[PDB]
Amino acid sequence: VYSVAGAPEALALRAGPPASVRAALLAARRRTLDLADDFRAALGDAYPGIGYAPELNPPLWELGHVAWFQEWWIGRNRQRARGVACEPDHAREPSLLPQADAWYDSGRVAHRTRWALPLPDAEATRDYLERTLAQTLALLDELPPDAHDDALYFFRLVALHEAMHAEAAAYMAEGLGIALREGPQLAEDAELELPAQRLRMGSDAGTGFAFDNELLSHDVSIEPLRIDAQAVSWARFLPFVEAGGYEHPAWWSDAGRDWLARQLLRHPAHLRAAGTGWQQRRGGRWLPLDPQGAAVHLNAHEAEAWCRWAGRRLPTEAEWECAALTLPGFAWGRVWEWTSSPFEPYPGFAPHPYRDYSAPWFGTRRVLRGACHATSAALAHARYRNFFEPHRRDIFAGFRSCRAP
Ligand SMILES: C[N+](C)(C)[C@@H](Cc1cnc[nH]1)C(=O)O
Ligand code: NA
Numbered sequence: 411v412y413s414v415a416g417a418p419e420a421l422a423l424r425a426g427p428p429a430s431v432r433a434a435l436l437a438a439r440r441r442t443l444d445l446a447d448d449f450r451a452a453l454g455d456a457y458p459g460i461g462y463a464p465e466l467n468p469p470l471w472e473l474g475h476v477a478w479f480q481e482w483w484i485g486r487n488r489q490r491a492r493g494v495a496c497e498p499d500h501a502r503e504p505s506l507l508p509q510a511d512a513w514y515d516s517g518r519v520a521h522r523t524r525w526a527l528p529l530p531d532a533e534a535t536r537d538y539l540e541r542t543l544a545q546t547l548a549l550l551d552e553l554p555p556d557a558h559d560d561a562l563y564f565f566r567l568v569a570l571h572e573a574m575h576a577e578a579a580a581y582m583a584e585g586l587g588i589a590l591r592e593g594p595q596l597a598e599d600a601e602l603e604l605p606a607q608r609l610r611m612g613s614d615a616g617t618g619f620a621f622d623n624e625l626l627s628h629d630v631s632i633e634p635l636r637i638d639a640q641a642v643s644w645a646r647f648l649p650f651v652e653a654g655g656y657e658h659p660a661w662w663s664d665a666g667r668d669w670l671a672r673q674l675l676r677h678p679a680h681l682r683a684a685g686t687g688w689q690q691r692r693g694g695r696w697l698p699l700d701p702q703g704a705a706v707h708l709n710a711h712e713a714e715a716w717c718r719w720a721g722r723r724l725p726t727e728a729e730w731e732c733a734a735l736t737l738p739g740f741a742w743g744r745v746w747e748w749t750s751s752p753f754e755p756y757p758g759f760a761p762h763p764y765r766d767y768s769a770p771w772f773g774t775r776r777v778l779r780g781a782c783h784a785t786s787a788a789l790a791h792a793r794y795r796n797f798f799e800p801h802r803r804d805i806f807a808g809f810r811s812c813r814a815p
C-alpha cells in the first residue's frame with residue numbers, strides 16, 4: 411500500500427480488502443454530507459436552490475445523483491460479482507425511489523431540465539442516501555477478506571464516483587460563493603531533469619481497480635526534458651498578464667484566440683485588479699492575492715499562451731506520469747495540471763460497465779493530471795486521467811511547464 415503514485419488511501423481503495431473499501435465508502439459519505447450541510451447553511455432548503463449555469467447542478471440533484479449511482483451499480487445490479495464483465499444494460503431491481511431513474515440518470519435527464527424537477531425535499535434526499543448506503547454496506551459485509559477484484563469492482567467504482575462529486579461540490583461552491591468547512595502555497599519555482607527513458611504508461615492487471623481509460627498499459631518513449639518541480643505560481647504567471655499577454659494574440663492558438671475573443675475579463679477567473687495589485691476570490695470572499703500560491707482557474711488556452719510567451723511548453727501526459735513516478739522533488743496535488751495531450755484511448759482501451767465514463771469524451775476533452783486540494787486522497791493517483799474541455803476555468807486547474815534541453 412506504500413507508493414509514490416498515490417496516498418495509501420488511494421491504493422487501499424483500488425486494491426485492498428473489503429474492510430478498506432468499507433472505510434472508503436464511509437469516509438466518502440462523511441465528506442459528501444459535510445459539504446451538503448455547508449451548502450445547506452448558505453442556501454437553505456428551497457429547490458432548485460441556485461441560479462442556472464452550465465457548470466453547476468442543483469445541490470439536492472447532486473446528492474440524489476450520488477445515491478442513485480451507488481444504488482444502480484450495487485443494490486440494483488444483478489451481476490455485481492462479474493466486475494468489468496457485467497452487462498451494462500441487464501434488467502435491474504427497482505429503486506427505492508420510483509422516479510429515481512427519471513431524475514438522477516445524467517445521460518437521460520438533460521442539464522437545463524434539472525432545475526424544474528420536483529425532487530424529494532432536503533430530508534427525504536438524506537433518507538435516500540442513508541438507506542442506499544445501508545444496503546450497500548450490508549452487501550459489502552457479505553464478501554470475504556480475500557474477495558476477488560471482480561467481487562469488489564463496483565464497490566470501488568461507486569466510492570470513486572462519490573469522491574469525484576465531492577470535488578465538484580468544492581469547485582461549484584467557489585462559483586457560488588459558498589464557504590466550506592473543509593476549505594494553498596507553493597514552495598520554490600525550480601527545474602528538474604527528466605532523462606531519456608522508457609515508461610510503461612497506464613495501469614497494469616495485477617493491481618486492482620483501474621479506470622477503463624488507464625488501459626492497456628503500454629510502453630512510451632520519454633525524451634530528455636527539464637520540467638518544473640511544482641505548478642506555476644501566481645508570481646510566475648502574472649508577469650505574462652502584466653506584459654499585456656492577453657492583448658497579444660500571437661501568444662495564443664487558433665482556439666485560444668477564439669475563446670479570448672469572447673472574453674469579458676482578460677485575466678484569470680476569480681482574480682480581479684486592485685490598484686497595481688490583485689485580489690483573489692475564495693469562499694465567496696475577496697482577499698489580497700498571494701504571489702506564492704499556485705495559479706488556478708486557468709484554462710488550457712491560458713496555460714499554453716503563458717508557455718509560448720515564456721518559450722516553454724506543457725508536458726504530454728506521458729512526460730507528466732513519468733516525472734511523477736520517478737523524480738523525488740516533483741510535487742503535485744495542488745491544482746490539476748493541463749497537459750498537451752487530448753483525451754484519447756490507450757492501445758487496447760475497452761469501455762467498462764459504466765460505459766459513458768470516458769468513451770463519449772474522447773477528442774473534445776484535454777487531459778489533466780495530478781490532483782487539486784479538493785481531490786479526495788482516495789482518488790488522487792499519478793496514473794489517473796482527468797479530462798475537461800480546454801476552455802473550462804471553474805475547475806481547480808493550473809499547469810506546470812517544461813522544455814527540451
Ligand atoms: C472525471 N470527471 C471529473 C471528468 C468526471 C467525473 C464524473 C462524475 N460523475 C460522472 N463522472 C466529470 O466531471 O464528468
Ligand atoms: Na512527488
Ligand code: NI
Pocket residue numbers: 475479516571575
Ligand atoms: Ni456522476
